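Input for the complex:
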Amino acid sequence: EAAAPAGPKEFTEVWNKKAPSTLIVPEFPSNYTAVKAVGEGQVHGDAFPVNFYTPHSILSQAQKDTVVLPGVDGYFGVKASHVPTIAQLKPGVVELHSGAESEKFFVSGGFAFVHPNGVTDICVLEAATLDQVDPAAVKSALAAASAAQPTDEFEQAANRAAIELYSALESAVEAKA
Amino acid sequence: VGLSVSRVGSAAQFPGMKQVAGTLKLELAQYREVAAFAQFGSDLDAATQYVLERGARLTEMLKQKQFAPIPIERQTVAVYAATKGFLDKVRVQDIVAAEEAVISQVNPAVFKILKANGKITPALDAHLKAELRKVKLPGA
Amino acid sequence: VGLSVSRVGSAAQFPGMKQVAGTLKLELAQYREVAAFAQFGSDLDAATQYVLERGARLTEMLKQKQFAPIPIERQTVAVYAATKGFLDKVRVQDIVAAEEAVISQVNPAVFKILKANGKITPALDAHLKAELRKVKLPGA
Amino acid sequence: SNQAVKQRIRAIKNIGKITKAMKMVAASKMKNAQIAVEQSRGLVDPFVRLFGDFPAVNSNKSVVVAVTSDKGLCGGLNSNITKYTRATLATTESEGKDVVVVSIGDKGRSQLTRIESQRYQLAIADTYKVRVTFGQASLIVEELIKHNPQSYQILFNKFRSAISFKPTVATILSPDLLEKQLEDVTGNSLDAYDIEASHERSDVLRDLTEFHLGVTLYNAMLENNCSEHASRMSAMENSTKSAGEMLGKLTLDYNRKRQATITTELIEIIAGASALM
Amino acid sequence: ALTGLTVAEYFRDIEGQDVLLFVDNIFRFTQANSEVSALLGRIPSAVGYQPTLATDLGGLQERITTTTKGSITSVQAVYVPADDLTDPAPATTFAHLDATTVLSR
Amino acid sequence: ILGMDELSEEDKLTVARARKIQRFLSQPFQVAEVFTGTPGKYVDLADTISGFQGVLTGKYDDLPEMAFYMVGDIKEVKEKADKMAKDIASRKEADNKKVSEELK
Amino acid sequence: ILGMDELSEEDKLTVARARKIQRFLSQPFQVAEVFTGTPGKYVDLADTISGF
Amino acid sequence: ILGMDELSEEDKLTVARARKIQRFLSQPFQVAEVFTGTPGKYVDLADTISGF
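Predicted:
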């Protein structure tokens, strides 16, 4: 079932016999990570480590008490010892709760892995917070994005992504406090 | 060491020193070329690093202070203790103190045998390998 | 400026010109140390860029126009304008036209009190500092 | 014979000033690139803890990317990862695997052609010209997914500190072609996860490995750009050292020639005046 | 410089003191002896100097010593002509200097 | 100035072959054997012609630089690579069973 | 040394304009018509100032 | 090119030792007190060696 016993400690013992002996073994992206998935612990109670990422940012790497994620089936909340999950995220609002305060991060889609050790890894491309959104371009954006539909299937997909993103953005910018 | 030459004095020198100075000269030649090989500290080789530490051992071995010339047997024994083993534990710093401990702690009969025989006989470098292991080097 | 010297130095300078030249020559010295590095313009450095732009502000100030010698108070006012920072409004390609837009536009009373006093006074470097903002400097 | 040495002194002096300018601008560009690199390292970790790290897989098709530089004054960066590229192509190959060799940067097509001329198939360049963005890495990953391999190998220089750049191989497996097969250990290690996507798990892994390739590629060519800047910072520092050595030797030579010039030009005058007096 | 050395040599020999001498610009001593040798019709040696450069310098610098009575010490300002330390005037001067004190900006 | 890292690859071939033939023009002498220890080699004309032709065509690009240094023929660079290579492992393991005993 | 790529396009503008000026200074001579190939030109002063 | 706080913890100790060494090399002169105000301090040799 696992007919290629791969891994870094196997690559470093097979790589010594097929390479010149002058080159040291290349590094691997496992050596630059610390928190694993299957390993024990890493939750301790009501808090749990939430790694909210972005390609160009690290928005949070602290611990939170609950994480509301905008999954494609609907908004779910991750508590401490959640079930392991690979949730694909719809355009919506992540809120990282740490008590009474709530940072409302509107993401544009991505993924969110809850690992067996209780580590939440939200992985989105763009995550704007809700105050830096203007409500003026979203309405003409929905009006124009509900208008131009040619026989292209590619623009049907891009226009459907447009209308669902801008409609979720108006739903989460007209329903604030 | 690379530019200074005395070929007329060569094959007219101390035979005990001529035994040890040949490998001293080759190791210093290798040290000069692995120092010219490293214009930079970024890539270590760990096979040239051996001769790069043996050469900095021999350079520290070779330097002496003013107005105290050394007899030829105590030069021969010190360079014998440098180009062979018996000095790899001291880093680069205490090799002057180690060479003084080699001169002071080794039995002074072996200097007389090296002086009167002129060269290192097999019965002499036997006691050289023996007497050099029972000295206590200050860099440990 | 680097090779020119005066072995009398600061003892025989106009006081008031003495008050601005002490930072003018230091700022030009730093600009000479970062000189020939302004060929990297988009390849910015953000701390040497300030001294590069200010050095270009100062070297275009000192240029002159051939049998038009300037009285010392007008030169002092021009150096006080350029070394205090009033001329970072100005495009560097027309600082030589900006100093007729300082000398001719500042009223000819600052020059008379600077000449007769023979040094910069707190009253004057309030007054002409206020006069150095109602000037029509050629910026874009 | 004393104006050739003077113009050589001028040549070596302006070369040294050019090189110190290049060193200080690479040292500035290394610091502004370190803002972007340490932020992009975060997103690599969830995929390497979710999919693991499997460099020696028995794939029958791989696409190898060596992330090289555009400008060439790096000082042995692109040659080091070309050595590492062929030393991984001689390692991960097992049975007759089709390997597509790709280079990111102009200095890769100059040397991967010299190593693997037939398996070289794609050349991405001009990527660090303005900046590196995720849409750019996404388009490069789309062009790699135009080929359909069972594995991806990304060869880049991990910027660790301002002096340490370690070459890194980062492996991305194709979703159910090899990735799910490498995760099942008598059951699966992926079947612990409750999949919360719309369509099947094959589709969510097909999306997730494209996103993993885009993230790995973006981080790879940020790390390699930061190591490029920090290696030009040390190459243009040794070159100022050697251009100071050459200038000192040329100045000693010029002063010897200046003294000899004054002596022979004076000896000519004495020899001409002693023939008349 | 010989006149200043005589004034110091009285204090050394007759008063028995530790005298300081300040030969300001020993290079100008060298320059003036070079001009004197040129006016006397002598063929100049290396770069342009007197043939007697080492001897006209050593005639000065060997009277600045420690005797059993006292000593003369010289703080001589040194000029380096083409910023060239191998020029014969500073190369001959540095053969006598027991110390250098570099004042820098 | 720039190091060897900025060369083209045919230029690195030029530098490698030129360092090889620079070392290969070196030769031990039968009158320098009294102060160097190396015995001196007479090299016949056909041998040096064929050796330098072989280094020029590329037949010895595998051999290192210092195997050409102070050797007679183009055979002796191969035997010096054989001697240099074999040692590349032989560095230690001369602990005891010596001639440096105390009774024998 | 580098190759005119790192000049911020205010230096590339004066490099191009200076190359144009360097070429525009050259002029064929009516006494060098038998040298190279070209009938020689006589430029007026007003045409010189307006062209430069 | 890297920053004053880029340095190691031992090299900052050498910077803080050398910066207070090169301060300590300065000295007020007895002849300079007619125009500097601060009086001049003759320093003996043993005091110099012990303090440094």
